[PDB]
């Protein structure tokens, strides 16, 4: 089998890449966004701490 | 003419690629900014060469070039809205003294408005809370909506006039982001002045057991309230509600706190009725010797819809009744014509209060 890590661009092309030393399979997850090169297709960041995100609107005041 | 001057320029501003830029909403900012564009595509940016760090804040337009992303200009939020650009209207026809009498439905609205902002620093002294909202309902033919006009004269700003009909759109749920596009103009553009027309199109309760289909119309209301007095008291400019049927609104809009100055309109008795023609006997003609008070007098009370029509019907009859000038004696064929002639029945004056 392997590891590998398939993923889906915002613009529904779906890329498979191999398993990058950036990541770890503990931290990586299906169902999130992380990002992704224009060219090689291969993640080099992964999740800045936040889901998805604040979508609409969100309410900053301390 | 123009066109020849703007080409000499015109080399640095089109051959070479500066303006092709993609626009769209920041929105988490790390300090990698991550946007996504109109065409739903997140992606990852930062500064450019001259942007400012305090000037990128979250839920901004960023336009980037289409090639390269990156951050070159800030831009104004919320600009996809068309419809409240052409609700400000510029230079009112009618002026402060248009507004005939010298009862209190004038001075008690320049106080609550036309004082706060031409005087701020006097109500400072007492340290109170001048009124966020008014209100003025009145019966139908009173020219209301005259007295809101004269008020964006004497207060050279920015003012809108906004349609009862207009805040319901096509589609459930818009509605919501109308009642915003109002309210975003007050923090951008300071000192204005906002005027609802016809409010008794959306308010009220209207609960639910009712047809069904009334459950968008009274979440407008809510959206309103909320970005009225919400949970943190955002406010800058005057509110102004106006309708003809204040028993139909919603008891909770019938409630202080978001509405402090009330002022109701009247019939005006002999005397103010005297001042109705007088505004006018400077303008038509006016024969020299006649008393404008018999003939408000034998006018029973009715709106001032009704009173200017006795001037402007005095003048018809100058070409059917061989006269010069509007005499005494078209005046009192008037009597029987402009009032008694057209009561007959679709006559509201006072016939509607209420439903």
Not at chain 1, 18 to 23: A, H, K, N, R
Not at chain 2, 112 to 123: A, Q, Y
Not at chain 2, 173 to 199: N, Q
Request: net charge positive.
């Amino acid at each position: 089998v392997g590891k590998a890590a398939v993923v889906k661009t915002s613009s529904r092309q779906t890329v498979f890449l191999p398993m990058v030393g950036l990541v770890d399979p503990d931290k990586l997850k299906p169902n999130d966004l992380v990002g992704v090169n224009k060219d090689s297709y291969l993640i080099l960041d992964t999740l800045p701490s936040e889901f998805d995100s604040r979508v609409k609107a969100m309410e900053v005041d301390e | 003419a123009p066109s020849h001057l703007w080409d000499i320029m015109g080399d640095r501003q089109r051959l070479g690629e500066e303006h092709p830029l993609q626009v769209a909403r920041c929105t988490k900012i790390i300090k990698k900014y991550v946007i996504n564009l109109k065409q739903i595509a997140k992606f990852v940016v930062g500064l450019g060469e001259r942007v400012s760090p305090t000037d990128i804040e979250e839920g901004m337009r960023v336009g980037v070039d289409r090639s390269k992303y990156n951050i070159e200009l800030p831009l104004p939020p919320r600009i996809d809205p068309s419809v409240t650009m052409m609700t400000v209207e510029e230079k009112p026809d009618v002026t402060y003294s248009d507004v005939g009498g010298c009862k209190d439905q004038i001075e008690k609205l320049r106080e609550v408005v036309e004082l706060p902002l031409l005087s701020p620093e006097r109500f400072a002294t007492l340290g109170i809370d001048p009124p966020k909202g008014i209100l003025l309902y009145g019966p139908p033919g009173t020219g209301k909506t005259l007295c809101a006009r004269a008020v964006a004269n004497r207060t050279d700003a920015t003012f809108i006039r906004v349609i009862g009909s207009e805040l319901v759109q096509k589609y459930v749920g818009e509605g919501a982001r109308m009642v915003r596009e109002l309210f975003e103009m007050a923090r951008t553009k300071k000192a204005c002045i906002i005027f609802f027309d016809e409010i008794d199109a959306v308010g009220g309760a209207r609960f639910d057991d009712g047809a069904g289909g009334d459950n968008e119309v009274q979440r407008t209301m809510l959206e309103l309230i909320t970005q009225l007095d919400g949970f943190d008291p955002r406010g800058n400019i005057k509110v102004m509600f106006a309708t003809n049927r204040p028993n139909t609104l919603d008891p909770a809009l019938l409630r202080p706190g978001r509405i402090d100055r009330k002022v109701e309109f009247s019939l005006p008795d002999l005397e103010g009725r005297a001042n109705i023609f007088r505004i006018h006997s400077k303008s038509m003609s006016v024969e020299r010797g006649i008393r404008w008070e018999l003939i408000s007098r034998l006018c029973p009370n009715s709106t001032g819809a009704e009173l200017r029509s006795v001037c402007t019907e005095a003048g018809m009859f100058a070409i059917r009744a061989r006269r010069k000038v509007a005499t005494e004696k078209d005046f009192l064929k008037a009597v029987d014509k402009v009032i008694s002639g057209y009561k007959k029945f679709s006559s509201t004056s006072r016939y509607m209060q209420y439903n």
